[PDB]
Amino acid sequence: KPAMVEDDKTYPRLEALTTAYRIQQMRNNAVTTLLNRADTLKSYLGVGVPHPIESNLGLEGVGQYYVRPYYNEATIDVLNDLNNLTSAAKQTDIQGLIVSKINEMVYTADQLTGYTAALEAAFSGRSPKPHVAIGTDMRLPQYIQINGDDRTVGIGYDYTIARISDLRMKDKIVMTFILPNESEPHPLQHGVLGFIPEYLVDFNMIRNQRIGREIRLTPRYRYFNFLPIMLVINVINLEEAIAQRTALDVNETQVTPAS
Amino acid sequence: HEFAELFYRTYIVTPDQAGFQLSIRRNLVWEGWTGEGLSGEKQEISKRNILQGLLDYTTLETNSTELIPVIQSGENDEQFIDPSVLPAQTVKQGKDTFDTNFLKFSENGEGFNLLMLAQTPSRLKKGSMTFTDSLDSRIALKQLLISVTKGGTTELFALDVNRDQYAAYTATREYNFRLMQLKFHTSLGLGEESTTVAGAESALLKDLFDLGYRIELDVKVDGEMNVENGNGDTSLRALRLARVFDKEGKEIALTDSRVSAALSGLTVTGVGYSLEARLTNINQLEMGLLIDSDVQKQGFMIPTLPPLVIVKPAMVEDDKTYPRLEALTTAYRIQQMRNNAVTTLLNRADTLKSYLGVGVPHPIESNLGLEGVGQYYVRPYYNEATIDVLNDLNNLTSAAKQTDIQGLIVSKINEMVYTADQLTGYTAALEAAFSGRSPKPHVAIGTDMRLPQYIQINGDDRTVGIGYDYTIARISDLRMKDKIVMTFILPNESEPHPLQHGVLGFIPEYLVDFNMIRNQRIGREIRLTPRYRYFNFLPIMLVINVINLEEAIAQRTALDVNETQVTPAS
Amino acid sequence: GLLDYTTLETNSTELIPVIQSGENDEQFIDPSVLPAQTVKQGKDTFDTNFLKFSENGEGFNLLMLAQTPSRLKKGSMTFTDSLDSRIALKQLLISVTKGGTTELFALDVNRDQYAAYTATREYNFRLMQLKFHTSLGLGEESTTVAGAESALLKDLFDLGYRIELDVKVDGEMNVENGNGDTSLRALRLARVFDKEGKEIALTDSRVS
Amino acid sequence: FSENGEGFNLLMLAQTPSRLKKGSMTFTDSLDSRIALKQLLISVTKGGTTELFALDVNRDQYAAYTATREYNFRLMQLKFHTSLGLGEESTTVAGAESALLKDLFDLGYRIELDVKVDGEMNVENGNGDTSLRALRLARVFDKEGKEIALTDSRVS
């Protein structure tokens, strides 16, 4: 801005600066880290293959000292995997398919990772239950939230559901196990946010024979990942199944002689 | 009447203005400017709006502090690898364009100078390599390029190494004061789907991969760097095949005949590496992202309309030639408040077909030929859909058929409303433009006299959506027959605002009564001059068409079973 | 009127150009390019066309054209008839030529944000100005004469490419005299669009 | 007079050598409050001979730019609607009396041309446009301040 007249019209108040900072840092870097962690787990562990504890040196996370590595991927085809008998009950059936699949994924992960044993070993005098953290886009959660007659989103498992407007996580469901009640880094957590505060420094610069006031913020933050466990599932072709009705996969018993 | 005031809020104006003018400030983001060193380009470049940043991902991600190696022909062609193995890659930071390649390991050779090596065209004008360039606290490897060779065929693997056990430079307990070293010892695993660089699945390890096997490559690399003057050297110490695994993660001896035959001809060597460093200057010589604001202000003005009058002989009272005074008022109220509004709505529908295409969003300030100031707060969006209830409705019993059709149509409405909220970003616009509370997007449903009773009887799966409010508008006009029109409406505001769908430009007019001896006759007349117009702001709307409604009710359509290829026909 | 709309909505004061065929022919486009159409006001039917752009001075008098036979029988053009607060371009025409083939499009620029005569205070005190600069788009599945496709823009429309024409039009009008003028300053295509909303260069093989 | 295609960026056009040597100019390099037409260059042609008359049209009532009530908030417009004349003793190239208009000047006649020039200018990045829209001869004046008919034998 010009360094002879204050201008709150071209440059707004400090709030615009702070909110631009807040958006950039606290959303885009985190999304990059999460998706890159997904991709690197894909690259190293294959698909759906448990690994012996501390036998996968070459991928961060002190969590590998307590839990077997595990990454699995799944695909839901709502158009070809939904069951209807009446148009009035289609959304409940959609919820049924999605919740049943997520429950199956959670149970299989808990089965082959042995997370319960690690959890009970790490903390004594208490036996908490594994907590599922689920993130997704701005359209799906209300197809997870109950409507009339529906069952719990994961039986016996407590959960949290998050909202994000960014367009990578469109029709995406990402989940893992975390500890909600701890504020200091543990090997069991998914990751921690290393943070170093920045203070504002405002002063004049003479750049290429200039006269102008300059405002600078240098951020200091870094995202680290601990638990090498995560499940990535995507749902495709939803609105078509909602608008176009499918029904009644029928398997003939070939009593009409062909076998 | 309900309909006209539903989409067009009444805004009254005194007769002393020819129109109303709006002023809106926009806050926008953009990097680098013309100045006078080149005075580059006419009509300059484009500037982005910040609100688009909430939905996009390369809008804010900028890097200028990164110290990436840069090629200069005839200057540093010796420090880089031979480009005959891998062609140089192109990278962009700031506004410079240049080619890069992986730095190579040298054993007995001289160390390089990372600080100097990363001079980019932006720096050179700003000054070449002054004192106060100091490397950041952490410097780490990102990729390693090992050549797995099978029978003369070379495949390069850009193994992402930035994420691993130990790649962060560590301060030394002794020796000099700023000598940071690299002590790198681990095994890097090649997964069964670990792709070759530049796409393409690994075609060499397929033989082990088809059996589901994997190889363990241990890597022996050391290095050192000075964080004051940018000097340092790195050397590879050892690299060889260490272990081979099965699908169960059980050690398999290299002496087995099959794996040994599959491993015949395998030699692995390290080609080069790439190293990340950030130039933490305390004085700094970058221009960040410039932030400004611009103001676009619009002029809206309101004309008159053709007059209406009744004439009658000026000696008598009549209910024959003139019933009371109410006739003109009723005619005028029709004139104003129904046909013109409906015509405006339909013309907007046609216009949005003409411009936006079917069901495709556009970025912010993507078009200016569209009417309405609301175009700066949301992506434009127009989508249409039709439901063939005859070919789509589910029938179980003849008793619940109306409930079934109601559920189908309401589910379709929910789909469109939710996907509109997803694609437009209207929700965040409401969150921002008003800060006292976060109101739910208030939805209005306008349609003819036919449909509404098939929308609300009983058994609503979801009303119009959870936490959504609705208002049902009904009208008798024909050309709206058998359609559904919906949009987004603010019920709590009265003044012009970019989040209104429309505002009814209205100035009062009063009766004109006096004698005119014209055409050489005498009569009493009542001149009525209406002056109003409809002004609409928000460029978002959704429409739904229904066909075969009569066909489905009076003819059964059930169970389009989908036989799935069990009767042998493949 | 309760059911149909056309039983009402009468015009009797709007000023529309009228062909006298020999008395004001110079101020219309020639009939060899676009045949005149018949329109009705009140009980009077007549011919109308588009006012030619003033390529070289010679402004036009608006009241000299708006004598309908109903106004002819009403005697001389009344001296006190003044224009309304609003005067705007109701319809803009474009002619695209490729290889000698001429086609006309009807772009409805009515009610657009930058197409209303605004009061100007630099000259006199009853002068209205027009200042028209925007991008007039052409429908990918519409905009031929009232919609639908064309015979010269197939290559873009089949793949669905959208064209933006930048327009520079300036105009002035006097709401007491009836003298006014209108001129086209510049007219050409600048950008080409698609579904994705990202422009394509004018040098790509298909677009070129 | 640029009419079609690109306009002109004035800030590009004023890159004097000293400005090259000094580097770059400061932020928000803004134009003058007013913009003026310092000269209008018209050409007179009679039979194939062209003579240039440099009419300094500055300080006439309508050579000033004003802000628009639409578009951007920095766009200033130019509307120059007036009559320009060429006289016997007014400053002109090849003397106050030129060769192509000597006949009228000897008869004491001075010609008046109606000029209609309009334009656009922005004071933020230096881009703008101007177009010549109308220019012809309209009235002829004698040594006595009364308009003479164009159909009269001598003037015609």
GROMACS .gro file of C-alpha atoms in nm, chain A residues 8-10 12-13 16 24 27-28 31-33 40 42-44 49 51-52 57-60 64 84-88 90-91 137-139 142-143 145 147 165-168 170 207 216 222-223 225 239 242-252 254 258, chain B residues 25 27 53-55 57 60-61 138 160 162-165 186-189 191-194 214 243 245 247 249 284 286-288 291-293 391-394 396 403-404 407-408 411-412 415 418-419 422 427 461-462 466 559-564 566-568:
model
  124
    8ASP     CA    1  -0.840   0.073   0.432
    9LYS     CA    2  -1.019   0.061   0.095
   10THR     CA    3  -0.764  -0.114  -0.129
   12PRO     CA    4  -0.885  -0.414   0.403
   13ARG     CA    5  -0.820  -0.436   0.776
   16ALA     CA    6  -0.851  -1.016   0.553
   24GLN     CA    7  -0.428  -2.145   0.335
   27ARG     CA    8  -0.693  -2.630   0.509
   28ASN     CA    9  -0.477  -2.675   0.200
   31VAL     CA   10  -0.541  -3.181   0.267
   32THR     CA   11  -0.213  -3.220   0.078
   33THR     CA   12  -0.058  -3.414   0.366
   40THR     CA   13   0.244  -4.330  -0.017
   42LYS     CA   14  -0.073  -4.729  -0.140
   43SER     CA   15   0.275  -4.729  -0.292
   44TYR     CA   16   0.448  -4.913  -0.009
   49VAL     CA   17  -0.190  -5.683   0.311
   51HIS     CA   18   0.258  -5.662   0.772
   52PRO     CA   19   0.449  -5.800   1.072
   57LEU     CA   20   1.126  -5.004   0.790
   58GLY     CA   21   1.108  -4.727   0.532
   59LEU     CA   22   0.791  -4.539   0.625
   60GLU     CA   23   0.745  -4.295   0.912
   64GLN     CA   24   0.460  -4.921   1.364
   84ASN     CA   25  -3.531  -5.130  -0.400
   85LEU     CA   26  -3.892  -5.246  -0.379
   86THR     CA   27  -4.056  -4.906  -0.352
   87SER     CA   28  -3.957  -4.553  -0.448
   88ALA     CA   29  -4.044  -4.430  -0.098
   90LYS     CA   30  -3.470  -4.573  -0.171
   91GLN     CA   31  -3.272  -4.334   0.050
  137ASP     CA   32  -1.730  -3.369   0.141
  138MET     CA   33  -2.027  -3.133   0.181
  139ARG     CA   34  -2.289  -3.362   0.020
  142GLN     CA   35  -2.669  -3.629   0.536
  143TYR     CA   36  -2.676  -3.963   0.353
  145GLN     CA   37  -2.710  -3.929   0.920
  147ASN     CA   38  -3.361  -4.077   0.871
  165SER     CA   39  -1.568  -2.773   0.100
  166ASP     CA   40  -1.247  -2.848  -0.092
  167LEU     CA   41  -1.301  -3.042  -0.412
  168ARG     CA   42  -1.052  -3.324  -0.365
  170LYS     CA   43  -1.583  -3.487  -0.324
  207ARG     CA   44   1.290  -0.197  -0.377
  216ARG     CA   45   0.499  -0.985   0.581
  222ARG     CA   46   0.474  -2.877   0.969
  223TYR     CA   47   0.238  -3.176   0.950
  225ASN     CA   48   0.198  -3.852   1.057
  239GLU     CA   49  -2.737  -3.919  -0.836
  242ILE     CA   50  -3.136  -4.169  -0.705
  243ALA     CA   51  -3.299  -4.042  -1.025
  244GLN     CA   52  -3.294  -4.374  -1.214
  245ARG     CA   53  -3.450  -4.670  -1.037
  246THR     CA   54  -3.279  -5.010  -1.029
  247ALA     CA   55  -3.438  -5.323  -0.882
  248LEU     CA   56  -3.430  -5.697  -0.833
  249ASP     CA   57  -3.117  -5.876  -0.950
  250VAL     CA   58  -3.266  -6.213  -1.048
  251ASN     CA   59  -3.068  -6.537  -1.074
  252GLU     CA   60  -3.249  -6.806  -1.275
  254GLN     CA   61  -3.161  -7.270  -1.519
  258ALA     CA   62  -2.946  -7.491  -2.019
  284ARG     CA   63  -1.663  -0.366  -0.295
  286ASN     CA   64  -1.164  -0.809  -0.241
  312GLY     CA   65  -1.012  -1.965  -0.306
  313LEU     CA   66  -1.252  -2.136  -0.068
  314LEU     CA   67  -1.333  -2.390  -0.342
  316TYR     CA   68  -0.666  -2.552  -0.462
  319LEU     CA   69  -0.327  -1.994  -0.289
  320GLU     CA   70  -0.045  -2.249  -0.309
  397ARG     CA   71   1.576  -2.840   0.799
  419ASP     CA   72   0.956  -4.063  -0.279
  421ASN     CA   73   1.087  -3.715   0.173
  422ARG     CA   74   0.858  -3.931   0.388
  423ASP     CA   75   1.067  -4.196   0.565
  424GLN     CA   76   1.238  -4.294   0.890
  445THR     CA   77   1.740  -4.800   0.595
  446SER     CA   78   1.582  -5.035   0.344
  447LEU     CA   79   1.352  -4.908   0.069
  448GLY     CA   80   1.082  -5.151  -0.040
  450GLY     CA   81   0.586  -5.264  -0.378
  451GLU     CA   82   0.417  -5.488  -0.632
  452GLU     CA   83   0.249  -5.181  -0.786
  453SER     CA   84   0.530  -4.928  -0.734
  473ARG     CA   85   0.843  -5.808  -0.323
  502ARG     CA   86   1.574  -5.945   0.130
  504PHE     CA   87   0.942  -6.151   0.073
  506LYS     CA   88   0.259  -6.250   0.025
  508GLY     CA   89   0.569  -6.137   0.486
  543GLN     CA   90   1.383  -1.116   0.225
  545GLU     CA   91   1.012  -1.163  -0.250
  546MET     CA   92   0.685  -0.991  -0.330
  547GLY     CA   93   0.439  -1.246  -0.187
  550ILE     CA   94  -0.394  -0.783  -0.217
  551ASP     CA   95  -0.623  -0.512  -0.352
  552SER     CA   96  -0.990  -0.421  -0.383
  650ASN     CA   97  -4.091  -4.570  -1.678
  651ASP     CA   98  -3.933  -4.497  -1.338
  652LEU     CA   99  -4.193  -4.525  -1.059
  653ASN     CA  100  -4.184  -4.830  -0.830
  655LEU     CA  101  -4.553  -5.274  -0.499
  662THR     CA  102  -4.721  -4.237  -0.175
  663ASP     CA  103  -4.461  -4.398  -0.400
  666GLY     CA  104  -4.156  -4.014  -0.255
  667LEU     CA  105  -3.997  -4.035  -0.599
  670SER     CA  106  -3.628  -3.749  -0.365
  671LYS     CA  107  -3.558  -3.592  -0.704
  674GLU     CA  108  -3.113  -3.443  -0.514
  677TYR     CA  109  -2.841  -3.065  -0.237
  678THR     CA  110  -2.625  -3.083  -0.550
  681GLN     CA  111  -2.268  -2.844  -0.327
  686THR     CA  112  -2.399  -2.185   0.168
  720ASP     CA  113  -3.935  -3.906   0.312
  721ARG     CA  114  -3.766  -3.569   0.365
  725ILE     CA  115  -3.311  -3.168   0.647
  818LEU     CA  116  -4.078  -5.437  -1.141
  819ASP     CA  117  -3.836  -5.382  -1.429
  820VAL     CA  118  -3.641  -5.691  -1.323
  821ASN     CA  119  -3.281  -5.703  -1.443
  822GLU     CA  120  -3.189  -6.061  -1.531
  823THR     CA  121  -2.814  -6.092  -1.477
  825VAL     CA  122  -2.736  -6.665  -1.560
  826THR     CA  123  -2.909  -6.808  -1.863
  827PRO     CA  124  -2.599  -6.885  -2.071
   0.00000   0.00000   0.00000
